mmCIF file of C-alpha atoms in Angstrom:
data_model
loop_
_atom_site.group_PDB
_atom_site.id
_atom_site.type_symbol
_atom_site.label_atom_id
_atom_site.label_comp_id
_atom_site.label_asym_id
_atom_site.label_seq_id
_atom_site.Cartn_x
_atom_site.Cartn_y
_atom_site.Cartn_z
ATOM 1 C CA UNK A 1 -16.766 -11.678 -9.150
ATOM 2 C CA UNK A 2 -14.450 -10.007 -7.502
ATOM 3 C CA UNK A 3 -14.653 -6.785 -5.503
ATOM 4 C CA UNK A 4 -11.660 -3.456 -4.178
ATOM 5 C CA UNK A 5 -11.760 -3.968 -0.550
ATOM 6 C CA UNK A 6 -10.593 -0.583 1.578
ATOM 7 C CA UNK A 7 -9.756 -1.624 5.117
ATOM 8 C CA UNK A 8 -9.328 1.245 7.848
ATOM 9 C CA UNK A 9 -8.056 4.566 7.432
ATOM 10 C CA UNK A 10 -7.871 8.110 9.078
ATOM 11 C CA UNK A 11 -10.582 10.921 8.625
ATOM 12 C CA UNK A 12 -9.993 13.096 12.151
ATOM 13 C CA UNK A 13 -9.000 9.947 13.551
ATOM 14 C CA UNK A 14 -8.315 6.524 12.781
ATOM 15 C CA UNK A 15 -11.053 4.272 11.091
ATOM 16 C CA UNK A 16 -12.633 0.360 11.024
ATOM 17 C CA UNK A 17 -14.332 1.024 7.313
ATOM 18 C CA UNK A 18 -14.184 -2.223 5.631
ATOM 19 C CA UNK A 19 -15.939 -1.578 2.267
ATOM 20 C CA UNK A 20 -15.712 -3.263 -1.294
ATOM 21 C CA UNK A 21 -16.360 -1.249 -4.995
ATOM 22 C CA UNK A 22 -18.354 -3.090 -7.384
ATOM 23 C CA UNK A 23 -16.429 -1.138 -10.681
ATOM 24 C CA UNK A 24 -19.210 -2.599 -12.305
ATOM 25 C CA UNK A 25 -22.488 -1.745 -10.484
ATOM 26 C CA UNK A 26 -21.114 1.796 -8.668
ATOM 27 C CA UNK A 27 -21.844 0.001 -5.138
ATOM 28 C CA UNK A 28 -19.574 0.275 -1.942
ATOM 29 C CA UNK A 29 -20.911 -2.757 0.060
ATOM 30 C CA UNK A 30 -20.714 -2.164 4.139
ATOM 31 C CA UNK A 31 -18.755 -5.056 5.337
ATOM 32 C CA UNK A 32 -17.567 -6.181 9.035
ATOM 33 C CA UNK A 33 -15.568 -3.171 10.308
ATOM 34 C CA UNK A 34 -12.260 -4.041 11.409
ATOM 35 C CA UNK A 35 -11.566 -5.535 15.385
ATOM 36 C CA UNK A 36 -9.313 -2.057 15.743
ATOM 37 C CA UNK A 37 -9.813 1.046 13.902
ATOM 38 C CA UNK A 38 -6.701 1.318 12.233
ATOM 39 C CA UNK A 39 -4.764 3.839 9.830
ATOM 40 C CA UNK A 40 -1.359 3.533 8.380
ATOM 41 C CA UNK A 41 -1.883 0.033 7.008
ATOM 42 C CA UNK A 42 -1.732 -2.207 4.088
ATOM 43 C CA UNK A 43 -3.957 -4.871 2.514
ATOM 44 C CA UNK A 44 -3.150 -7.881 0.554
ATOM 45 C CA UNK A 45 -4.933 -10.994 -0.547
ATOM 46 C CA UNK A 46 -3.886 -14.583 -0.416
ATOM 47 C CA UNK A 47 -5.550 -17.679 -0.558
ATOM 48 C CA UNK A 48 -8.802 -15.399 -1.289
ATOM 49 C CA UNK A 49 -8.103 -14.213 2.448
ATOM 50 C CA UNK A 50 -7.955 -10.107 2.568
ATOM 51 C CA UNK A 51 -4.977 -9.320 5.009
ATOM 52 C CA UNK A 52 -5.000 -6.205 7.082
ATOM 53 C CA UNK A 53 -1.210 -5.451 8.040
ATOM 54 C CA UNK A 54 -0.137 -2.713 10.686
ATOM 55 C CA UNK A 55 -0.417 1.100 11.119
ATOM 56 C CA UNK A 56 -1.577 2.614 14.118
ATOM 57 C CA UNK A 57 -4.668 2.985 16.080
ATOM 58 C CA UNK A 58 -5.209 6.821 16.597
ATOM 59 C CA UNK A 59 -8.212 6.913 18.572
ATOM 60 C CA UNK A 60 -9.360 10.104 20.858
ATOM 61 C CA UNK A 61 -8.004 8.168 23.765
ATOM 62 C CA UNK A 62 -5.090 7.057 22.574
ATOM 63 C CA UNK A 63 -1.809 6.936 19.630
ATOM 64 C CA UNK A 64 -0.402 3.635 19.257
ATOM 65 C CA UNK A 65 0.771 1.911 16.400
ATOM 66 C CA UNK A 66 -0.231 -1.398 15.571
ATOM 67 C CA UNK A 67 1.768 -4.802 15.135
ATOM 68 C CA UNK A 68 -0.840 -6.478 14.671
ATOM 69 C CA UNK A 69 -2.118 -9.042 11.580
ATOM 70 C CA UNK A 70 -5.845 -9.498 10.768
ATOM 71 C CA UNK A 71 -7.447 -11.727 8.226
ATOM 72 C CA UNK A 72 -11.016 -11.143 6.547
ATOM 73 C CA UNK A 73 -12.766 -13.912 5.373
ATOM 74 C CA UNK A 74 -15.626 -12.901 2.055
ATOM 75 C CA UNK A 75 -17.211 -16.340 2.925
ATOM 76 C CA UNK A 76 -17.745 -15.688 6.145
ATOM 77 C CA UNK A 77 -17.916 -11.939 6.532
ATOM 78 C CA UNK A 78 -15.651 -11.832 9.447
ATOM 79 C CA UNK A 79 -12.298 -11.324 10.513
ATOM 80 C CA UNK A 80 -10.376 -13.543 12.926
ATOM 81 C CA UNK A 81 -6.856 -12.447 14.185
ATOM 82 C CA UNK A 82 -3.750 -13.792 13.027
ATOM 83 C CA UNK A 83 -0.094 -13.809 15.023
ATOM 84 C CA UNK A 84 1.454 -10.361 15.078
ATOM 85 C CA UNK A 85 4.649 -8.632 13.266
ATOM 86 C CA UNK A 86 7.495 -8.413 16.272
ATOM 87 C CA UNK A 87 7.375 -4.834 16.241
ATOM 88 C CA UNK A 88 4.781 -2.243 15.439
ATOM 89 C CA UNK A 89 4.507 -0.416 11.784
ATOM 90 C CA UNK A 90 3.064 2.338 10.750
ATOM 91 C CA UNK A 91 2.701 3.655 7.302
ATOM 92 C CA UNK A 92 4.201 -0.270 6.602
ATOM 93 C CA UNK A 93 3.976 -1.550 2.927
ATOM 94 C CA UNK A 94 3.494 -5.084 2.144
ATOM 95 C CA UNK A 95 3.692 -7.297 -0.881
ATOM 96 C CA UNK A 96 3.290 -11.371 -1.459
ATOM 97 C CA UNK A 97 5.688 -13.601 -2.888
ATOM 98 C CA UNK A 98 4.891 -17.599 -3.158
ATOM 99 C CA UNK A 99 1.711 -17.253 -0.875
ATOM 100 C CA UNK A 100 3.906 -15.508 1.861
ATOM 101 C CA UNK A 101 3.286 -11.856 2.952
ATOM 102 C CA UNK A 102 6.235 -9.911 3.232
ATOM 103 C CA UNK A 103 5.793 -6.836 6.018
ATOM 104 C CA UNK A 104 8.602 -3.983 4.888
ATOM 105 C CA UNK A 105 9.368 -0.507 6.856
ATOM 106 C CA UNK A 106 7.040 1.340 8.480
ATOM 107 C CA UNK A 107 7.511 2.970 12.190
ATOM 108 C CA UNK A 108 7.288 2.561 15.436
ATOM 109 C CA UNK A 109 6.944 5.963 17.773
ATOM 110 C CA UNK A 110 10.118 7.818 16.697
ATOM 111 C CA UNK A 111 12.077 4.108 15.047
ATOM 112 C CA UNK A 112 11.783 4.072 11.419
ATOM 113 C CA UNK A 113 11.990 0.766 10.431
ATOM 114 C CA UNK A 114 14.834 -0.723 8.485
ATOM 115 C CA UNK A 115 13.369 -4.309 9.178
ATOM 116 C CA UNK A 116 11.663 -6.348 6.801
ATOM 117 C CA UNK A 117 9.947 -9.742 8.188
ATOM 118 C CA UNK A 118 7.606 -12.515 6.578
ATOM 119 C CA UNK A 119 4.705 -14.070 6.940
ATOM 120 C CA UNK A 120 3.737 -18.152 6.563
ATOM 121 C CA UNK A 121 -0.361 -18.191 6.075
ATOM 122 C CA UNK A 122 0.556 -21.949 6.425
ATOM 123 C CA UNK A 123 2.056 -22.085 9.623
ATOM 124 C CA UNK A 124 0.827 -18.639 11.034
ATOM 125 C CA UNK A 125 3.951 -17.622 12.083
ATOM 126 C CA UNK A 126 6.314 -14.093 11.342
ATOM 127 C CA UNK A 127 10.088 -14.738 10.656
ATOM 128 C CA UNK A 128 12.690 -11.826 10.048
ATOM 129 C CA UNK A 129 14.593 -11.178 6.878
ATOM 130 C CA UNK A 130 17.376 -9.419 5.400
ATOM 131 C CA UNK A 131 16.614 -5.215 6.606
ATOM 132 C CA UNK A 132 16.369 -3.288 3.575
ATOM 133 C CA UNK A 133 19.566 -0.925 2.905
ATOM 134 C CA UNK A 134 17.336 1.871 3.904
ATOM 135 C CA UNK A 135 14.787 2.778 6.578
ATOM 136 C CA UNK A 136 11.684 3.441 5.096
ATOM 137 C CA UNK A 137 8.491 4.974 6.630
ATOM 138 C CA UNK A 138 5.779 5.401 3.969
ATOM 139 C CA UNK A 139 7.045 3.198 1.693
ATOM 140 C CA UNK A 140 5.147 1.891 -1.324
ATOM 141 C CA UNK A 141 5.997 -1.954 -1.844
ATOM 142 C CA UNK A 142 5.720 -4.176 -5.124
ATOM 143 C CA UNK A 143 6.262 -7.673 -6.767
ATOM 144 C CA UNK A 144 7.540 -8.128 -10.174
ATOM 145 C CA UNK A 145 8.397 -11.307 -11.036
ATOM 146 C CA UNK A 146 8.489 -13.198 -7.831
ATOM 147 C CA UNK A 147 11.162 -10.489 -6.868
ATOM 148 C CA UNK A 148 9.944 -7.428 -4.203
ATOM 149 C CA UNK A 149 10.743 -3.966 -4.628
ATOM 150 C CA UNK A 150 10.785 -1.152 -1.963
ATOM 151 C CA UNK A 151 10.054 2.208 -3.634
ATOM 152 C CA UNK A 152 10.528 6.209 -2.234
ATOM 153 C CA UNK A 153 9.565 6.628 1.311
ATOM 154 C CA UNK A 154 10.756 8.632 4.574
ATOM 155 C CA UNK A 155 13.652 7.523 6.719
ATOM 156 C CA UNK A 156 13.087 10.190 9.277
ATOM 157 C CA UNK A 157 15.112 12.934 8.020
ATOM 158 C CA UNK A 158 14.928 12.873 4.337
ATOM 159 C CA UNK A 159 12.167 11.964 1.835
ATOM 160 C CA UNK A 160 13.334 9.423 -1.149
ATOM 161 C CA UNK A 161 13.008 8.386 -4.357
ATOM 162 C CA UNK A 162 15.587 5.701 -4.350
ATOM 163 C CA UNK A 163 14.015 1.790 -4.943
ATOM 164 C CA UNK A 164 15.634 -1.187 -3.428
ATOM 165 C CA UNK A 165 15.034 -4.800 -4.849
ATOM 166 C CA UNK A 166 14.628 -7.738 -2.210
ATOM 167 C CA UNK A 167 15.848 -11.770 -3.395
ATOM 168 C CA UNK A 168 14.088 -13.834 -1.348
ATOM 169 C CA UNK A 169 16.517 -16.676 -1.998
ATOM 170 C CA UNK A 170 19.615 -15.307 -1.539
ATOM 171 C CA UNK A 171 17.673 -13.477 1.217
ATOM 172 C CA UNK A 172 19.544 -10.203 0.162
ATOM 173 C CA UNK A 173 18.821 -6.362 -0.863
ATOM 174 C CA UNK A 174 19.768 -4.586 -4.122
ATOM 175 C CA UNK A 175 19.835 -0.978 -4.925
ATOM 176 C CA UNK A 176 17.843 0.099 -8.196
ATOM 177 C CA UNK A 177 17.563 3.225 -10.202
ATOM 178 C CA UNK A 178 15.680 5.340 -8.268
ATOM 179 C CA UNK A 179 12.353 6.994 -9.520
ATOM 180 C CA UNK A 180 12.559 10.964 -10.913
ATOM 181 C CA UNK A 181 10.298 11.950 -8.268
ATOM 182 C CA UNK A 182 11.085 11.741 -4.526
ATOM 183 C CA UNK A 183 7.706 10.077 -2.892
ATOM 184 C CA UNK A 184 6.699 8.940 0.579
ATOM 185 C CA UNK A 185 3.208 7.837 0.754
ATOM 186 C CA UNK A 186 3.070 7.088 -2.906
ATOM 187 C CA UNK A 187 0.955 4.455 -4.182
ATOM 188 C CA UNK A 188 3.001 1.535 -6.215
ATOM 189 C CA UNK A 189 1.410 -1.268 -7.532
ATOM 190 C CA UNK A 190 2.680 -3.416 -10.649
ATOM 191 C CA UNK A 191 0.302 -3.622 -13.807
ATOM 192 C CA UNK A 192 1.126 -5.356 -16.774
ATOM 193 C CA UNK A 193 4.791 -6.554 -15.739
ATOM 194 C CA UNK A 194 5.711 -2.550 -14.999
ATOM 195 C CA UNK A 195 5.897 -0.550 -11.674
ATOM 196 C CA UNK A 196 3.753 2.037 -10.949
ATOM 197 C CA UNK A 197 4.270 4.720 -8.157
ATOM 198 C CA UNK A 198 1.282 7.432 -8.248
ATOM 199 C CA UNK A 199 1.487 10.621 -6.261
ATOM 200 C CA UNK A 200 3.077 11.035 -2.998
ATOM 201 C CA UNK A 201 4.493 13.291 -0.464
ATOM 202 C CA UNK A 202 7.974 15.178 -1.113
ATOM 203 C CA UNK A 203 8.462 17.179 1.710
ATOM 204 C CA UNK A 204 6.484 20.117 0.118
ATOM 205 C CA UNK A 205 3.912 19.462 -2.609
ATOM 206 C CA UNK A 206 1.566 16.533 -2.696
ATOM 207 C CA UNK A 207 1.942 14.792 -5.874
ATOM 208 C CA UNK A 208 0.111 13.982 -9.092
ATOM 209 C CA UNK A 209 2.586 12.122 -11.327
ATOM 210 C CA UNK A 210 2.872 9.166 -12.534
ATOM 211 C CA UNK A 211 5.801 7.264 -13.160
ATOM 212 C CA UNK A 212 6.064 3.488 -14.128
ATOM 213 C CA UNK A 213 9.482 1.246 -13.767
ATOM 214 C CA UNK A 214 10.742 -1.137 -16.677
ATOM 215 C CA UNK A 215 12.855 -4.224 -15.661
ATOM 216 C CA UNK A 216 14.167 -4.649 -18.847
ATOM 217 C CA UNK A 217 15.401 -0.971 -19.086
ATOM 218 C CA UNK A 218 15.725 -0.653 -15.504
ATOM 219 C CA UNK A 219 13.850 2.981 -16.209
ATOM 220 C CA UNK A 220 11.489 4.526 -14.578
ATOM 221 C CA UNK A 221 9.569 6.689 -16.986
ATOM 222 C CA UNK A 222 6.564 9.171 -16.452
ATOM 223 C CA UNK A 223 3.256 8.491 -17.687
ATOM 224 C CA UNK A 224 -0.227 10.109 -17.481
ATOM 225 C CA UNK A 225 -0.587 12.394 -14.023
ATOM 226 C CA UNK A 226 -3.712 11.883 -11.451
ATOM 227 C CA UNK A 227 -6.503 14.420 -11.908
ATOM 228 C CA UNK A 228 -6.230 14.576 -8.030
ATOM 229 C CA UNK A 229 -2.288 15.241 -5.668
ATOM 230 C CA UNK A 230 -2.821 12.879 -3.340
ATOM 231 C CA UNK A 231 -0.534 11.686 -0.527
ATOM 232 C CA UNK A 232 -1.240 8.304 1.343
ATOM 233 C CA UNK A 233 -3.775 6.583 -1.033
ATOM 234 C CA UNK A 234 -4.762 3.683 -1.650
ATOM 235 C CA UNK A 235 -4.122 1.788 -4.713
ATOM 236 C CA UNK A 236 -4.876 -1.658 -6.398
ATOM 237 C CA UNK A 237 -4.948 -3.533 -9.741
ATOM 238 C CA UNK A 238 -8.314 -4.595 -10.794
ATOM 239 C CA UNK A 239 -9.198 -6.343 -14.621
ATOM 240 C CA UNK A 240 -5.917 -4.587 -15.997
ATOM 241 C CA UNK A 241 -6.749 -1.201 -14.428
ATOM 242 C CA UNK A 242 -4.938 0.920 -11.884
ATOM 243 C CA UNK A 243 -7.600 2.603 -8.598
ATOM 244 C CA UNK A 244 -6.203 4.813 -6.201
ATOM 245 C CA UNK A 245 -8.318 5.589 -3.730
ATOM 246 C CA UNK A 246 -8.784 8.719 -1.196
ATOM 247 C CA UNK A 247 -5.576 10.097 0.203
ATOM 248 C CA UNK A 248 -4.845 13.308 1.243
ATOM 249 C CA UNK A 249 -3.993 16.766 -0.545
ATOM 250 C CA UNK A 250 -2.409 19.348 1.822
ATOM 251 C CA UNK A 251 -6.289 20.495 2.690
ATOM 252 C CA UNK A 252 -8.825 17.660 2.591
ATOM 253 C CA UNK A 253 -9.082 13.823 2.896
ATOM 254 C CA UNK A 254 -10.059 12.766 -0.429
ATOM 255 C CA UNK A 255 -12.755 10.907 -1.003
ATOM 256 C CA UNK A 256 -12.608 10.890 -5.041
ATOM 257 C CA UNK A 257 -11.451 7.235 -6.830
ATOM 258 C CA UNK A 258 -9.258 7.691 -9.885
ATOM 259 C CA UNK A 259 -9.123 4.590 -13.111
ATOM 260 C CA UNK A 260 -5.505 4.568 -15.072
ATOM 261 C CA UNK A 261 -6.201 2.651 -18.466
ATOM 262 C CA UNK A 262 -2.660 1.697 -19.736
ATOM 263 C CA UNK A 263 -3.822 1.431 -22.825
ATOM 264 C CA UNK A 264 -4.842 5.175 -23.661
ATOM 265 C CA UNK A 265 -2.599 6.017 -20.704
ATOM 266 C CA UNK A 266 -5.851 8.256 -19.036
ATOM 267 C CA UNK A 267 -7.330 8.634 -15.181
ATOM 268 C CA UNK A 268 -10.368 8.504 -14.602
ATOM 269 C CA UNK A 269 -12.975 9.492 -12.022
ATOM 270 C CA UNK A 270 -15.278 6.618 -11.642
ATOM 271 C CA UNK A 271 -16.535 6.660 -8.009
ATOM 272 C CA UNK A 272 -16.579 8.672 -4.479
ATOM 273 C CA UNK A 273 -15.967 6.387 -1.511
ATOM 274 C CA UNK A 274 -18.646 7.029 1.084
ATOM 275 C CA UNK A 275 -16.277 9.294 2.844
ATOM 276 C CA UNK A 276 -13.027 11.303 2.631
ATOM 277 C CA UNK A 277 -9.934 8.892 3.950
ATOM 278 C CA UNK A 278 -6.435 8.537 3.641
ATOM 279 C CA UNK A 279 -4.052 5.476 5.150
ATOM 280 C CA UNK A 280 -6.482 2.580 3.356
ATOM 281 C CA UNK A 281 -5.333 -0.886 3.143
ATOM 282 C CA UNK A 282 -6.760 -1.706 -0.327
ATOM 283 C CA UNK A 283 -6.523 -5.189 -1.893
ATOM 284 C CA UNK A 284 -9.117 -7.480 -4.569
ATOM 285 C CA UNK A 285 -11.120 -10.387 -3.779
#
């Protein structure tokens, strides 16, 4: 059995929601909240462990964005800390290659981070890699085939919609074609060996499209649009299905959960998280 795990979040200010959908049963379980309340960050899962990566703790009392690594245990219900990034990152994305977490972008007061650095679970330990050609706030992150893929974004100035491919062993950065829409705060995942980036910001509108990258063509090519724009969602892959949870919509955090089936290439509203949120870290365990 395995569960959609939001972590954090910002609704007026930041959040320590930690909360799992049962797709089957409709249920949002309450979970351990998170040490920090924390928006701006990204999930992952390795090992079984949920990771909570980054963003920025935007309390009442204070802005500061967050270095920081945290690890929540489903066994245990709790979280324990892990060593931090070497420099804070908001509105980071992450993705995992061999069992290592790979941190990418984000920013750090007025830096936008070019810098891309890696995790060890083994050895708890952060080491830096090759920057990305491009500094990236807001930048949606993905794995195909053991390779990892940096996708739209904000680099302070200018919104994108150019992608940049990372090879871990040559330890080296590769433009790609870029997507047709320009997105920061898009939500890219990878279902079914393809790409996904859904919605976005572009500087003006918040975004419903769709569009879906192909290796093999290296195209990116739209697909079916979200019922909902949406601008820093959440989004995961769970039994062959795309979720993108909350985000935000020019007006109002969204609370509403949207379903992509690939194969009638339809969204779906299946659930309402228990409040309106945007900046999750959402991951399956």
């Amino acid at each position: 059995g395995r569960l959609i795990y939001t972590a954090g979040g910002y609704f007026r200010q930041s959040l320590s929601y930690l909360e799992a959908y049962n797709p089957s049963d409709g249920t949002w379980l309450r979970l351990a909240d998170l040490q920090v309340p924390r928006s701006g960050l990204a999930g992952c899962v390795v090992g079984g462990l949920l990771y909570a990566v980054g963003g920025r703790n935007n309390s009442p009392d204070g802005n500061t964005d967050s270095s920081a690594l945290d690890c929540y245990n489903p066994m245990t219900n709790q979280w324990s800390p892990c060593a931090p990034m070497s420099v804070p990152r908001n509105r980071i994305g992450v993705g995992v290659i061999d069992g290592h977490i790979y941190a990418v972008g984000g920013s750090h007061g007025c830096i936008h981070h070019n810098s891309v650095e890696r995790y060890e679970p083994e050895r708890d330990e952060w080491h830096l890699v090759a920057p990305m050609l491009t500094r990236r706030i807001g930048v949606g992150v993905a794995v195909l085939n053991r390779l990892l893929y940096a996708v739209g974004g904000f680099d302070g100035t200018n919104r994108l919609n150019s992608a940049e491919c990372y090879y871990p062993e040559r330890n080296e950065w590769r433009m790609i074609t870029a997507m047709n829409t320009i997105r920061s705060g898009a939500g890219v995942c990878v279902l079914h060996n393809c790409i996904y980036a859904a919605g976005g910001y572009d500087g003006q509108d918040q975004l419903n499209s769709v569009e879906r990258y192909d290796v093999e063509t290296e195209t990116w090519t739209f697909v079916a649009p979200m019922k909902h724009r949406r601008s820093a969602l959440g989004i995961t892959v769970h039994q062959g299905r795309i979720y993108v949870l909350g985000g935000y919509d020019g007006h109002t955090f969204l609370d509403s959960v949207e379903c992509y089936d690939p194969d009638t290439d339809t969204w779906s509203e299946v659930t309402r998280m228990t409040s309106g949120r945007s900046g999750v870290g959402v991951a399956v365990t």
